[PDB]
Amino acid sequence: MGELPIAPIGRIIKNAGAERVSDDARIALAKVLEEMGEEIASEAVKLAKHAGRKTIKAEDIELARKMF
Amino acid sequence: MGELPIAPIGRIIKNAGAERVSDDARIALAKVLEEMGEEIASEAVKLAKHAGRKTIKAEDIELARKMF
Ligand SMILES: [Cl-]
Ligand SMILES: [Cl-]
């Protein structure tokens, strides 16, 4: 948790069509995306270990995302 | 799209327990999180306009996340 920088998150909300954005909404969306990222990456670690690898690959992320 | 920097995404996957991460998995998870962020923020813009505001607030992000 707390990995994403806040300035890029406000650009996500502006690019989605917001006129103005509070810094409290940037912190809220960063928390949602870091939680979703942790859930998908923990499934991807298990998929890589099931495949016999130590490296997480794109295919592990794509398959993990389909579990959600 | 393309708002999130790639280095913080690799920290999400390492913090979730990966030993090693390919730069192709960092690009893949960034794409997933930017898509989810756009969907949640577009719903939050509609909630703010329904409330009569031009500013997106934390409560708009939290309510939008419950629609997913
Ligand atoms: Cl490996
Ligand atoms: Cl306002």
Judged on CB neighbours under 10 Å (0-12, 13-18, 19+), A38 is middle
CA atoms of A11 and A8, how far apart (whole Å) = 5
Judged on CB neighbours under 10 Å (0-12, 13-18, 19+), A67 is exposed
Q: Looking at beta carbons, which residues of chain B come within 8 Å of A30?
A: none
Q: Among all residues of chain B, which has the CA nearest to that of A36?
A: B33
Of A8, A17, A34, the CB nearest to B12: A34
CA atoms of A17 and B59, how far apart (whole Å) = 17
Give me the resolution in angstroms, 1 decimal: 1.5
CA atoms of A52 and B48, how far apart (whole Å) = 48
CA atoms of B43 and B37, how far apart (whole Å) = 10
What is the per-residue DSSP string for A4-37? S-HHHHHHHHHHTT-SEE-HHHHHHHHHHHHHHH
Q: How far is the CA of A19 from the centre of ligand 2 (A)?
A: 9
Segment holding B56, helix H or strand E: strand B55-56
Dihedral angle of Cα A63, A57, B1, A18, to the nearest 10 degrees: 70
**Fold type of domain B1-68:** Histone, subunit A (1.10.20)
